[PDB]
Write a protein that binds this ligand. Structure first.
Ligand code: NCD
Ligand code: NCD
Ligand code: ZN
Ligand code: ZN
Ligand code: ZN
Ligand code: ZN
Ligand code: ZN
Ligand code: ZN
Ligand code: ZN
Ligand code: ZN
Lengths: 362, 362
């Protein structure tokens, strides 16, 4: 007896195209998404070239339209030079991404004044998401208040961060956040097994107390999002390991295991992988789209999942209960039992759908 | 220049059919909904007979399918005799409604133990909404905690209530709530003009301090819902006035006025009339459905709106800015400039759509 879920949405993926296609491309990363029960992804802008201007966005849109197998929206990235220049294309993007700490990106902003300039110039009705760790969460929240608008905090990983966000919500501030599966299901206790290269990720893996604080504060978490950040094993095991984990294929099985164990409900999961992504990012419904999962099947995560070109996973060896059996996307069978059955280019840019534009005052 | 909105959802309407059809019926109340920019309604069970058992629900479903002009879901009502009997039909309903205070209903429960029995027997994945005023909000929240599930509080009207809910959310408790327009736009200051009959409503109109507390605590309000509660002028002005106001045709114009004045944003409005209703009640998307509004048109609310059979309104004389120009429902023009253009029976029970069933574990 399968369970039918709506089309799930991952608001934080790195699909590496253009410029890092040995790590992943639109076709492989969206195959991974479909196999993970994800029918819509929002792709981050830290590509090569980065998606920081209109020509780069135009290129990325065409590469995604030609390669994506599921539907998508593309983020724009904030840079030290593009505030005030994105107004014509802003509404065609998922939102604006700010990189406020060291990570796999060349887009770090060097002054809080640059953050303010982005918050002041980006259209006020459109999403802003921030990579903001530890005190940076408080700092970007201050900038959001000074500019009288909302912000969404990416990949929250620490007790410190979730409690700060909790305090902000208690004061009625317009802040939302997401948590990635590695920060719910891995911790410092796993660094022995992973090693220092594979274990590299931003935010870094937390303590057991960090993990327990995220679970205890599930009510504060608006979304789950994978932060699918594929890099090859050679890169992760080499001299200058880039941070990041692949995660599209493992996110839903990990979370279904937690549902089966009573750690959160099916509804809690669907709020965080469907309804809240829709409402925060104004992402449209997908007609005739659903995911069928088998909640009884027990399996062990292998050394690599079938689709991501990362060809490794930090969850290797974990026992899960729950698997994706079938995905239907817009009336077509997109995935069955290990086979993706829609070609590259089946996926569409949801921001071009009439129902996918963000509503605004004239 | 019109603004396109998605199909708005009102999770709290009284359509009076069966048994009170001089006040409203499915055809007239859903005409009123469409003229108010509402494309989906959830109808309350305090009809005659009340929707408290499977035969009554079956009758109401057929009357709604034959009369509704917009889409709908029907609540079941909790009674002193039906706990443990609704399991076969529960998933076909919008949710379960509990009447916990005196109001226009014969369904009051006489003991908190009866509330517990409903929370224990109603399927745990399906919505429960409560009419719960003042301390009753705290009482039903306790019952929800004892039974380890969520609750949604109808028509919050008082500083006391919104602050209690705020405190509960700060403790991470699974509670949501809605506020009706009369509790945002009318107060004791209006009882002089309304008189004691017309002014009768449950919860009663609040003080200016109550109104100001609801606005100040907008972040705590998950949904707006009209509590459209039509009664004729003869009834409202007679010896034993029933409580309630009609409100479908005035809700969106009142709230658009507030948006135009900067009291809340367009997004704040759409979270509360679209996204949060969807996610709390698991209501499906409506394909090819949207509402076009004109935000510049200033008008004065007349002594009665065109469609509701209530034929009166407590908002008479208020100046508003914002009007519904066109509604498209599932690919058909449903309303233009004062004319409803879909017939009775165009509307459908969304709980029968594949995408409208509430997901559950097997
Ligand atoms: N999280 C990571 O460790 N890496 C991400 C970048 C990011 O989300 O910051 C990547 O693009 O590789
Ligand atoms: N609110 C009211 O004053 N009346 C409502 C009942 C209700 O919502 O309690 C009605 O059905 O007339
Ligand atoms: Zn990041
Ligand atoms: Zn993110
Ligand atoms: Zn990332
Ligand atoms: Zn939206
Ligand atoms: Zn009520
Ligand atoms: Zn209600
Ligand atoms: Zn009511
Ligand atoms: Zn749902």
């Amino acid at each position: 007896k399968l369970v039918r879920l709506p089309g799930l949405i991952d608001v934080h993926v790195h699909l590496r195209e253009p410029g890092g296609t040995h790590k992943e491309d639109f076709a492989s990363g969206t195959a991974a998404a479909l196999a993970g029960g994800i029918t819509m992804v929002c792709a981050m802008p830290n590509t090569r070239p980065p998606i920081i201007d209109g020509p780069a966005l135009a290129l990325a849109q065409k590469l995604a339209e030609a390669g994506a197998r599921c539907d998508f929206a593309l983020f724009l990235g904030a840079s030290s030079e593009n505030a005030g220049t994105l107004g014509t294309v802003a509404g065609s993007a998922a939102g604006l991404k700010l990189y406020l700490n060291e990570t796999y990106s060349e887009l770090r902003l060097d002054s809080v004044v640059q953050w303010m300039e982005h918050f002041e110039t980006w259209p006020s009705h459109l999403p802003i998401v921030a990579h903001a760790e530890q005190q940076t969460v408080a700092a970007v929240l201050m900038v959001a208040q000074l500019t009288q608008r909302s912000v969404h905090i990416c990949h929250v990983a620490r007790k410190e961060e979730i409690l700060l966000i909790k305090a902000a919500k208690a004061r009625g501030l317009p802040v939302t956040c997401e948590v990635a599966p590695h920060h719910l299901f891995l911790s410092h206790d796993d660094l022995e097994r992973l090693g220092p290269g594979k274990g590299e990720v931003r935010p870094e893996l937390g303590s057991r107390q960090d993990v327990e604080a995220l679970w205890e504060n599930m009510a504060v978490i608006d979304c789950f999002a994978s932060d699918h950040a594929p890099h090859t094993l050679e890169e992760k095991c080499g001299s200058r390991p880039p941070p990041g984990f692949p995660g599209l294929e493992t996110m839903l099985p990990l979370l279904l295991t937690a549902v089966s164990e009573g750690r959160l409900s099916l509804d809690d999961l669907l709020q965080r992988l469907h309804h809240n992504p829709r409402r925060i990012f104004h992402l449209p419904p997908q007609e005739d789209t659903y995911v069928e999962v088998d909640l009884e099947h027990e399996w062990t995560i292998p050394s690599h999942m079938p689709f991501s070109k990362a060809h490794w996973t930090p969850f290797e060896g974990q026992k899960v209960k729950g698997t994706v059996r079938r995905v239907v996307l817009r009336g077509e069978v997109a995935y069955i039992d290990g086979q993706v059955l829609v070609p590259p280019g089946y996926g569409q840019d949801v921001r071009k759908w009439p129902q996918g534009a963000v509503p605004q005052l004239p």
